């Protein structure tokens, strides 16, 4: 392991997939060192009409991958004779851009969560900022992999294919917890859902700070 | 390739030269030769023959006549430029 020094960081983005949808909470707010330059930032990208991706780690680095993915998609869609962006195509392509940069002694760090729906299969994939692809059950990204993920995994172990609602309470719960354990967080966070409709990510919505507990 | 052997056989009938001269041997020795060139071989064979003072052409004269044709005659020949148009 190594990671570049991060200035503007995206941290804790959970993702767990339900049938023909995924629910995600990712912070909408990206601190730059100390100052929260944009409390309004969007870590969510549109590859194509039934794909979405959400990324953590250095926010800056995420934007480099967006453009390469963007230029490739622009050429490939619209024509749709048999060639277009497809769920497998976006996952692998984005992994290779990350691999290319892994070969150099500085790599561009973003850790990404792809939810896609390709030609016949609904996919929930994890892409790393050094490369690697797999299908995933639930994955965290950035700070979520060390800090909350095991308690999220534990809730998933009886029921691995539960509803949107059950996911929605966990995610809403997770911001009060974010503030408590890690520092470079804001409580204006973004709820992103990738569905068959498109990729929707409405603006930052908030709930309690809850660091006012002191009862022992 | 088969056709060049047949031009030798038709030309030999006109001539009164040996039939103990293999028509085929001449045909292999000069491939990529037009109809005119195969008649010049017979002609040449005769030129060597008159100098020696023979009435009949030999196989010796013949062998010599094809190796001169394959090397020398090719440069002058009409075919590279006319075949490109054709």
């Amino acid at each position: 392991t190594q990671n570049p020094m991060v200035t503007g960081t995206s941290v804790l983005g959970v993702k767990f997939d339900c049938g023909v949808v995924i629910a995600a909470d990712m912070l909408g707010s990206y601190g730059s060192l100390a100052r929260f330059r944009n409390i309004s930032r969007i870590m969510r990208v549109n590859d194509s009409t039934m794909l979405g991706a959400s990324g953590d780690y250095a926010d800056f680095q995420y934007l480099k991958q967006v453009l390469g993915q963007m230029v490739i998609d622009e050429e490939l869609f619209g024509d749709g004779h048999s060639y277009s962006p497809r769920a497998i195509h976006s996952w692998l392509t984005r992994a290779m851009y990350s691999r290319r940069s892994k070969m150099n002694p500085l790599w561009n760090t973003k850790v990404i969560g792809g939810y896609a729906g390709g030609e016949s299969f609904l996919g929930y994939v994890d892409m790393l900022g050094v490369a690697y692809e797999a299908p995933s059950l639930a994955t965290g990204y950035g700070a979520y992999l060390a800090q909350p993920l095991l308690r999220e995994v534990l809730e998933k172990q009886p029921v691995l294919s539960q509803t949107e609602a059950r996911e929605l309470v966990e995610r809403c719960m997770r911001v009060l917890y974010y503030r408590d354990a890690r520092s470079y967080n804001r409580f204006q966070v973004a709820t992103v859902t990738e569905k068959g409709v498109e990729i929707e990510g409405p603006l930052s919505a908030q709930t309690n700070w809850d660091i006012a507990h002191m009862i022992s | 390739l088969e056709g060049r052997t047949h031009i030798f056989k038709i030309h030999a009938r006109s001539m009164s030269v040996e039939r103990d001269i293999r028509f085929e041997l001449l045909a292999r020795l000069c491939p990529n030769s037009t109809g005119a060139e195969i008649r010049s071989v017979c002609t040449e064979a005769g030129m060597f023959a008159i100098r020696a003072r023979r009435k009949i052409a030999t196989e010796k004269d013949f062998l010599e006549a094809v190796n001169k044709v394959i090397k020398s005659y090719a440069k002058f020949s009409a075919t590279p430029r006319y075949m490109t148009y054709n």
Partner: protein, 245 residues
């Protein structure tokens, strides 16, 4: 002249005492051979109507198609030789893709058209290569630049039109545009009109037989270049047929 081994049609660096360039002109006669592609600017989008040549009996949709997507919101209809058109599609799509990446806003048609025209024009100047044997239209909708229609010929000109035709019938087809008020008019009504113009212009010796392909890029598609629905195609086909009788 046309039968020669030096200059004239071998070159295009050549000039006659009139000033003409014959090779660039021979390229123009080539676009003329196949059927018409029309593209009509609305104040809200572009609608295309293209004859899609049926060259066999074992066709599937999109076969020998002339509708391309240069950018997400640009469509491209070609007329004339399809061989030259495929190479032209790659070059136009490439100039647009990089534009989106860098600028991050929807390619202005005025810019894209200038770059492809320069490329066609570099070949017409040269005697080293021949110039493309097709003529194309690029048509687009954006709210960052408005609805634009451009046309590029084998010479290397880009000028904007508000309704254009390329292909055999274009002198006849263009006349039908002067009749129509199309500068201000919904893209829904204009589809009905491009379809009826094509059906009447076609005859069995410009090309054997065609498949009607209409395309959207307007308020209806929300600024996306897409192919029209099965419903849309058929009603526009119907109106073409009823007007034909």
């Amino acid at each position: 002249m046309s039968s020669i081994g030096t200059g004239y049609d071998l070159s295009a660096s050549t000039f006659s005492p009139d000033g003409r360039v014959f090779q660039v002109e021979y390229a123009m006669k080539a676009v003329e051979n196949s059927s018409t592609a029309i593209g009509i600017r609305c104040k809200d989008g572009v609608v295309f109507g293209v004859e899609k040549l049926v060259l066999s009996k074992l066709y599937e949709e999109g076969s020998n198609k002339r509708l391309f997507n240069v950018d997400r919101h640009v469509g491209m209809a070609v007329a004339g030789l399809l061989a030259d058109a495929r190479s032209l599609a790659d070059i136009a799509r490439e100039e647009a893709s990089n534009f989106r990446s860098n600028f991050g806003y929807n390619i202005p048609l005025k810019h894209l058209a200038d770059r492809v025209a320069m490329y066609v024009h570099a070949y017409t100047l040269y005697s080293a290569v021949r110039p493309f044997g097709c003529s194309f239209m690029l048509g687009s909708y954006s709210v960052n630049d408005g609805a634009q229609l451009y046309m590029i010929d084998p010479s290397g000109v880009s000028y904007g039109y508000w309704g254009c035709a390329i292909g055999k019938a274009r002198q006849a087809a263009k006349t039908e545009i002067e009749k129509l008020q199309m500068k201000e008019m919904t893209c829904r009504d204009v589809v009905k009109e491009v379809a009826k113009i094509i059906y009447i212009v076609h005859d069995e010796v410009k090309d054997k037989a065609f498949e009607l392909e209409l395309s959207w890029v307007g308020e209806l598609t929300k600024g996306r270049h897409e192919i029209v629905p099965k419903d849309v195609r058929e009603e526009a086909e119907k109106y073409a047929k009823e007007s034909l009788k």
